[model samples]
Target: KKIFKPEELRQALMPTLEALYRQDPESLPFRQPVDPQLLGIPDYFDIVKNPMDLSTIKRKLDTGQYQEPWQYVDDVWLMFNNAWLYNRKTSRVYKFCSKLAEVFEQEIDPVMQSLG
Candidate 1:
C-alpha cells in the first residue's frame, strides 16, 4: 500500500474523527474543547494538562497542522485520556469514554497498518 500525503491522510481520517465526535448523541461533549466555566470545574485545567477535542483536531487538520497520521491519533488518544483522568472509573462519562476509545482503536488500526 502506498503511504498517504499529509492532506490525504487527514481526509482519510476525517470520518473517523467525525464518528468519534458524535459518539455521545445526547451531549457530544467530546466534540469541542472543555469549558471550565461552563462545567463549573475550576480545576479542570490543573488536572488535564493537555486537552484535546474533535473540533480542534478538525481545525488542525483543515489548517495543515498535522504532518503525520500518528499526530492525529495522538490527539484522539489525548482526548480520551483526559476524560479517563478526570472522571471516576464508576462514572458514566468514564465508561462512555472507554467505549469511544475502543471504537477509535478498532477504526484506526487498519489505517495505520496499511500505511506501512
Candidate 2:
C-alpha cells in the first residue's frame, strides 16, 4: 500500500513497466514531434516506443496506425530509454518496452513526470 523510497517503487514496477509501455527516447532542447519512423510495433496498450528502424515504422504508418504524442491529463509524464536515446553504449538502452499499469498505481507507486 505504501513505499518509502523511489528505488523500491522503481523496482516494484519493473515487471509491469516492462510489460506495458516503452521507454521513450524522444526529447529535445526544443519541443517537436519525433520522427514517427523511429517508433516501432505497438505495445499491448497500443503505445509506440522509439528507436525503431525507419522502414519498419514506415510500414506500420503506411498501414494506418495511430500516433503517440501521448499527453498526460491531470498529472503524469513519460520515461526515456537513454541508452537507446541518442548516444549510449551501442549495447543497449532498453531492449524491450515498459508496462503501463504501474504508472496508474495510486498509493505505493506514483511514477510520473513532475512539473515542479
Candidate 3:
C-alpha cells in the first residue's frame, strides 16, 4: 500500500470491476498483476492541477445521491461493503461475503448480463 499512490490503486481496481461485470465481482479474487493500461491512467495528478470538483462532489455524495432506479443496488452495495470490511480478516466476513455473493449471482448478475 505504501509503495503506490491512490491513482494507481484506482487502476488496479478496474480489472476486478470488469471481471465482476462479466461474471462476478469476486470471480477474479486477488493478487493479480497491477496493470494501468487497462484503466487508462493519466500521467499527471489532475487533482493537484485543478479542483477535480471533489468538494462539490463530496457535498452531493454526503446527501447519498439516489437514482431511484439503480439506488436499490447501490444500497446493497454500500451495506455489503461496510459489513464485509467491518468484519475484515475473519471467517465471519467470508461467510457474510459468501451469502452476498449468491445474492449477486442470483439477483444482480442477471440484469448486468442483460444490459450487455
Candidate 4:
C-alpha cells in the first residue's frame, strides 16, 4: 500500500487543480448574466487592469484609510461568472466551477481553523 502525505497529495493534485482554476468559462455550462451595476462600477478586474486605480486604493489604505479589496475580488469573481454565462448557458459548468471554488476555499480551512 502506498501512503501519501498531505503535501504529496497536494503536489500530485496541483496540476489538476491548476487546470481547473484556469478552465475557460466558455467551455462551462453555466450562463448567468453579469450585472456590473450590482457588482460595482469599479470592479476588481477593472482595478487590476488599471494599475493607477490599484495604486490609489493602496494609498488610501496606507493613510489610515480602509477599503475592501475583498469586495473587489468578489466583483472580479462575478465578472468571471458573467463571462462564463455569456459563453456557456448551462448550470453544469457553473456548478462545477462553484464546486471548484468550494474546494479552493476548503484548502484555506486549515489556516482559518487554527486561528481560533
Cα lDDT listed for each candidate: 0.82, 0.30, 0.38, 0.40
- Weakest ten-residue segment in model 3 by summed lDDT: 47-56
lDDT per residue as tens, model 2, 1-116: 23234344334434433333333442121123334345442331234343333233233324433122112211122333322344233423233211222333432233432211
**Order by TM-score, highest first:** 1, 3, 4, 2
Which runs in model 2 stand beyond 4 Å of their true positions? 1-3, 21-33, 36-116
**lDDT by residue (tens digit), candidate 3, 59-95:** 3334434323244345445444543443445655346
Q: Judged by lDDT relative to the true structure, which candidate is superior, 2 or 3? A: 3
- What tens digits encode model 4's per-residue C-alpha lDDT throughout 1-116? 33334343333334433433454563232223333466564463554342222223223334423232333334334434544443344656456656555554655345324322
Worst 10 residues of 1 by lDDT: 18-27
- Assess every candidate by TM-score: 0.88, 0.22, 0.33, 0.26
Clashing pairs in 3: 20-24
lDDT of 1 by residue, 37-88 (tens): 9989999999999899878988988887877788889998898899999999
What would you estimate as the lDDT of candidate 3? 0.38
Q: Rank the candidates by lDDT, best first.
A: 1, 4, 3, 2
- Candidate 1 TM-score to native: 0.88
> TM-score of predicted model 3?
0.33
